[PDB]
């Protein structure tokens, strides 16, 4: 499972944050699997049927409104019939108000649930029409609803591979030109941020390299002598803990491999990937962020 290099998403300035124009909060949430992210979107094909999409949105809203109206009318008729029955029986006004309040609260709940569905659809439509890369979705339920409903245009996954795909699909020269154009203008406040981002991007471009070096797939290990192995009177292992950290990383990778072979739902696999990322970050550096291992 691809991982990220601790020296970047935690560094100040965080090279990833500037290059990918993401706040540290969002980047760290993405890395440790806290919220999904929209990688790429074919906005054109959605625009070509944006009117048709709005039309189907309207008709589904009409259908939900229609079932809502059916329920409201049925319950209002039931309540009115109950009130007429109670009047015929000549019961006290206390019973009248009790039944009336019960029915009114039931209808308020029905309308509130209908408005729940309506605002859910409105959020879906807003986040669908008003959608672009680098967007976040904190709640998993909303993302599940999006993919189930509109799983055609935008592809979004949470994890290091997400960043890798985003950066490799991303281009540098266009952003460099846009930042240069912004700098050519004024507005010091945003101009300084533009200057910093342009500096980073120009360094990337001049380096002749690619940002893909910020997501690792194969960590190396130093020779054995550099981590000398020591035998005590009882032959105990008390040498540099480098062996301990490599043990942890290898053990967790093998657990990942075995688990993915066996098959299991997304929750366990994602948790396990997070644990692996934690171990690699610890090995490249202990105590950089969070509680150091002891």
């Amino acid at each position: 499972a691809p991982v990220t290099h601790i020296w970047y998403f935690k560094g100040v300035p965080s090279r990833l944050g500037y290059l990918l124009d993401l706040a540290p909060k969002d980047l760290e949430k993405i890395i440790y699997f806290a919220a999904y992210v929209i990688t790429s979107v074919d906005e054109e094909m959605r625009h070509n049927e944006l009117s048709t999409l709005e039309a189907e949105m309207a008709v589904e809203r009409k259908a939900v409104e229609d079932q809502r109206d059916g329920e409201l009318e049925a319950r209002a008729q039931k309540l009115e019939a109950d009130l007429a029955e109670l009047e015929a029986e000549g019961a006290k006004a206390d019973a009248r108000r009790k039944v009336r309040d019960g029915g009114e609260r039931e209808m308020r709940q029905i309308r509130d649930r209908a408005q729940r569905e309506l605002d859910r659809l409105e959020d879906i439509w807003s986040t669908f029409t008003k959608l672009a890369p680098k967007q976040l979705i904190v709640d998993e339920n909303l993302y599940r609803e999006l993919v189930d409903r509109y799983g055609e245009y935008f592809t979004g996954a949470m994890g290091a591979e997400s960043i890798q795909k985003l950066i490799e699909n991303f281009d540098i020269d266009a952003e460099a030109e846009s930042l240069r154009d912004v700098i050519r203008n004024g507005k010091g406040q945003k101009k300084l941020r533009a200057l910093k981002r342009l500096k980073v991007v120009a360094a990337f471009q001049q380096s002749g390299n690619s940002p893909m070096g910020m997501v690792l797939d194969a960590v190396p290990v130093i020779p054995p002598e550099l981590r000398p192995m020591v035998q005590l009177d009882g032959g105990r292992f008390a040498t540099s803990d480098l062996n301990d950290l490599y043990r942890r990383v290898i053990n967790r990778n093998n657990r990942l491999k075995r688990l993915i072979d066996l098959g299991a739902p997304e929750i366990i696999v994602n948790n396990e990937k997070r644990m692996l990322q934690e171990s690699v970050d610890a090995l490249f550096d202990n105590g950089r962020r969070g509680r150091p291992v002891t």
């Binding site: 290099h5 070096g213 690792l216 960590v219 190396p220 490249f284």
Partner: peptide, 10 residues
């Protein structure tokens, strides 16, 4: 540490 340290004898 993934830092490709070349020599550039040239």
């Amino acid at each position: 540490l993934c830092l490709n340290v070349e020599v550039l004898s040239s």
